[PDB]
Amino acid sequence: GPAVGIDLGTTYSCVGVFQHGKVEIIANDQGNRTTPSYVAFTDTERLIGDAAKNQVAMNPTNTVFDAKRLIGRRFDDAVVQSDMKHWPFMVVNDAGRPKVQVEYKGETKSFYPEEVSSMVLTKMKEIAEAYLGKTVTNAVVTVPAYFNDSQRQATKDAGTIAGLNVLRIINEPTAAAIAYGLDKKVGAERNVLIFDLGGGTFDVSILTIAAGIFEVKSTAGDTHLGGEDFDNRMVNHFIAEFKRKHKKDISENKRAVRRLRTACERAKRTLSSSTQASIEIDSLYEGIDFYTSITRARFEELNADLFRGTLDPVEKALRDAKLDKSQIHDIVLVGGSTRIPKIQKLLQDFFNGKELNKSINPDEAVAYGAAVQAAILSGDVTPLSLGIETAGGVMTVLIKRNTTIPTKQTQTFTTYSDNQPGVLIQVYEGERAMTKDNNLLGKFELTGIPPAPRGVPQIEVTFDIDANGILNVSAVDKSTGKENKITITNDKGRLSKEDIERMVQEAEKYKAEDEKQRDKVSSKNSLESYAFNMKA
């Protein structure tokens, strides 16, 4: 059977399959193309998805949601402690690990976060088996790009507990970019911005894509921004309008607030396609009908700070990627809140009128991409940065990865110590800040340097890659013309695509440590006479 793509989301999940040249997003038993990531425990039974979310107001302490915010984390994590305060269900500490604790069939029960997510995955797996008429065992599951190794491993465990063989865990922004065919471009590298406003979180990611390989350059966002915050601004507006018109505060009455909030969500969706929405609630409070309206402009005004606030993580991400906004080749809109026209207009104005990729249903695009990647797994540029070791074992890059071949790059270096008789040129490949974490390709010495104080002798190092892919590295003492050279072969099958992806992933994992190492370094043009990695 074909492998499925599963967007395991904070508030909802979505499953899709690539069949007959086309992705189909699979509707569940209620006919819905997404399924809430909720699990409810009752005296009679366990409910998953739509049934769970429907009865939440009736059974809030035994209805679990937001398990993705706990997955992979320790109880003591500051995120977990802050998030606990807002949840009606109990989270307890079992040997350093959080568990949700609920009453089920009269018995107190506790579940790890991955157990809860595995129940969501079982429901997704069942939804797909009903659609396909056959068992589903293979799946691609997505996670946020900022998930660390423990969160990724805990997501795979949930898939295993559910009986899925997880082919690969891939990042949500990568899924989205695959959905839009940005990997199939086959040309010079492209910078892609993924703008993901939905499922209770706001994530901005910048990716580079070249030769079928994705690298996450930077991520920013807000973990507690979503559509409910926009709806809440409307709710408080209408509570105030009711208090002003009828001198009554409906905040006392839980159901009244619930009815208003439901009306406000509906109006928000209307305002994405019309310039005004009608609110009609019979007997909202003390028998008073609440018939009114709201314009798109008022809704935008009510949310002005939240809407304009989404550009601050965009600016942050661009800074961390060391990119200007003009250097972004592709903008991709993911998440249900990106249907809001003011959001789209703010983003487009920020990018000087650049057209946005948004034709794929923004609620489904991540599942769309996972489904395509699952199908692939079922069935000329430099791959890695090139440089030499400078003083202290620092990787100093002469040719960034994704550089077009042929190419020639030269840089000038000096000596680290006084009267240094020679320098050791050590060629490395990789994306880490220290040579010890990259791959040594070759080394040669340039000796005969005339005695001089530190920093005086000038050594020019040249990296040349011809059309055949052979790398020639040479060094010249600029005071004498004496030189030395090494040739480095690039046979087919030296690096597999998997080897490249591994190197890229390690770079994304240690991006924090390495970027602070690049701030920490003082001189990146000094060369020593010994290999730093062989020094005791």
Please check if 201 is assigned to a binding site: yes
Q: If you compute the radius of gyration of the chain from its CA atoms, what whole number of angstroms results?
A: 28
What minimum distance in Å lies between the beta carbon of 169 and ligand LZ1?
28
519 tagged catalytic: no
196 tagged catalytic: yes
What minimum distance in Å lies between the beta carbon of 168 and K ion?
13
Contact stretch for K ion (CB under 5 A) within 1-9, 101-109, 371-379, 395-403: 1-9
Residues 323-352 that bind K ion (CB under 5 A): 335
Task: Single out the catalytic residue among 50, 196, 364, 431.
Answer: 196
What minimum distance in Å lies between the beta carbon of 295 and ligand LZ1?
58
Nearer to ligand LZ1, 284 or 465 (CB): 465
- Quick check: 420 binds K ion (CB under 5 A)? no
> Out of K ion, ligand LZ1, none, which partner does residue 382 contact, by CB within 5 to 8 A per kind?
ligand LZ1
Which residue of the chain is nearest K ion when measured via CB? 142
Find the helix or strand (DSSP H, E) in which 79 lies.
Answer: helix 78-84
- Quick check: 66 binds K ion (CB under 5 A)? no
52-90 b/e (C-beta count within 10 Å ≥ 16 → b): bbeebeebeebbbbbbbbbbbbebeeeebeebbeebebb
Please check if 415 is assigned to a binding site: no
> Out of K ion, ligand LZ1, none, which partner does residue 203 contact, by CB within 5 to 8 A per kind?
K ion
68 tagged catalytic: yes
The Cα angle at residue 310 between residues 306 and 316, in degrees rounded to 5: 140
Q: How many residues bind K ion (CB under 5 A)?
A: 8
The Cα angle at residue 179 between residues 130 and 168, in degrees rounded to 5: 65
Pairing type for strands 471-477 and 459-465 reads antiparallel
Contacts of 74 (CB under 8 A, 6+ apart): 80, 96, 97, 98
What minimum distance in Å lies between the beta carbon of 123 and ligand LZ1?
47
Contacts of 491 (CB under 8 A, 6+ apart): none
What minimum distance in Å lies between the beta carbon of 170 and K ion?
9
312 tagged catalytic: no
Please check if 266 is assigned to a binding site: yes
> Out of K ion, ligand LZ1, none, which partner does residue 441 contact, by CB within 5 to 8 A per kind?
ligand LZ1
Question: Taking Cα atoms as reference points, which of 142, 217, 223 lies closest to residue 175?
Answer: 142
- Quick check: 437 binds K ion (CB under 5 A)? no
Please check if 417 is assigned to a binding site: no
Would you list the DSSP string of 496-512? -HHHHHHHHHHHHHTHH
Task: Say if CB 267 and CB 277 are below 8 A apart.
Answer: yes
Q: Which stretches of the chain bind ligand LZ1, using CB under 6 A?
A: 382, 429, 441, 465, 469, 471, 488, 490
Type of residue numbered 211: A
3-state secondary structure at position 300: helix
Residues 139-178 that bind K ion (CB under 5 A): 142
Please check if 125 is assigned to a binding site: no
Type of residue numbered 175: A
Please check if 474 is assigned to a binding site: no
Please check if 61 is assigned to a binding site: no
Which residue of the chain is nearest ligand LZ1 when measured via CB? 490
> Out of ligand LZ1, K ion, none, which partner does residue 452 contact, by CB within 5 to 8 A per kind?
none
- Quick check: 363 binds K ion (CB under 5 A)? no
- Quick check: 201 binds K ion (CB under 5 A)? yes
Task: Single out the catalytic residue among 50, 66, 68, 342.
Answer: 68
Contacts of 22 (CB under 8 A, 6+ apart): none
Please check if 518 is assigned to a binding site: no
Task: Single out the catalytic residue among 83, 172, 437, 528.
Answer: 172
* Max Cα distance, the chain (Å): 97
Please check if 337 is assigned to a binding site: yes
Contacts of 233 (CB under 8 A, 6+ apart): 302, 303, 306
Sort residue 212 into left (φ over 0), alpha (ψ -120 to 50) or beta. Answer: left
What minimum distance in Å lies between the beta carbon of 492 and ligand LZ1?
12
Among 3, 4, 8, 433, binds K ion (CB under 5 A): 8
The DSSP call for residue 450 is P
Task: Say if CB 423 and CB 446 are below 8 A apart.
Answer: yes
> Out of ligand LZ1, K ion, none, which partner does residue 196 contact, by CB within 5 to 8 A per kind?
K ion
Find the helix or strand (DSSP H, E) in which 278 lies.
Answer: strand 276-285
Residues 72-101 that bind K ion (CB under 5 A): none
> Out of K ion, ligand LZ1, none, which partner does residue 231 contact, by CB within 5 to 8 A per kind?
none
Residues tagged active-site? 7, 68, 172, 196
Residues annotated within a binding site for ADP: 11-12, 199, 265, 268, 272, 336
Residues annotated within a binding site: 9-12, 68, 199-201, 265-272, 336-339
Which spans of this chain sit near K ion (rule: CB under 5 A)? 7-8, 142, 196, 198, 201, 203, 335
